[PDB]
């Protein structure tokens, strides 16, 4: 139901129903494609809502739960790229490209990160 309301670009009831789903399933389903999926979708909804703060933490906890995933790394790099933390997102992009071969959108994001790094002159 949350993915439904995310597709229609409502971005509100989707978040509400997904938070209800996770709070129902806080105790159980520690692993096995349920907590990861629900938390990733809530973080994805928050990125669409521009509330990047809680999104960084939720993506981080998903990442520490399971490391081998290109999508989570790509989205975390996207989140960091939304702010100015290029030093901490390029490593994520490189590891994401390491995990999965092509990742065309990730390649574009990494390239733009290179032009950003080239432009900037931090000490």
Backbone angles phi, psi at 68, to 5 degrees: -80, 90
Taking CB under 8 A as the binding criterion, the range among 11-19, 36-44, 49-57 that sits at the site for other proteins is 36-44
Q: Which is nearer to other proteins, 23 or 115 (CB)?
A: 115
Buried b (16+ CB within 10 A) or exposed e, 92-119: bbeebbebeeebeebeebbeebeeeeee
Choose which of 10, 12, 51, 112 interacts with other proteins (CB under 8 A): 112
* CB under 8 A, 24+ apart: contacts of 83-91: 83/52, 86/113, 86/116, 86/117, 86/120, 89/113, 90/117
Choose which of 78, 80, 92, 96 interacts with other proteins (CB under 8 A): 78
Interface pattern 10-29 for other proteins (x via CB under 8 A): --------------------
Binding-site ranges for other proteins (CB under 8 A): 3, 6, 31, 33-34, 37, 40-41, 44, 48, 64, 67-68, 71, 74-75, 78, 81-82, 90, 98, 105, 108-109, 111-112, 114-119, 121, 123
């Amino acid at each position: 139901m949350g993915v439904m309301y995310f597709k229609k670009n409502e971005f509100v009831k989707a978040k509400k129903y997904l938070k209800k789903a996770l709070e129902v399933v806080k105790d159980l389903d520690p692993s096995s494609r349920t907590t990861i999926s629900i938390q990733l979708n809530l973080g994805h909804t928050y990125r669409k809502l521009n509330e990047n703060e809680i999104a960084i933490k939720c993506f981080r906890c998903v990442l520490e739960k399971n490391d081998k995933n290109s999508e989570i790394h790509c989205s975390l790099g996207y989140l960091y790229l939304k702010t100015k933390k290029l030093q901490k997102a390029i490593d994520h992009l490189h590891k994401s490209l390491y995990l999965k071969p092509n990742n065309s959108s990730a390649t574009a994001l990494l390239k733009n990160a290179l032009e950003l790094n080239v432009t900037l002159s931090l000490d």
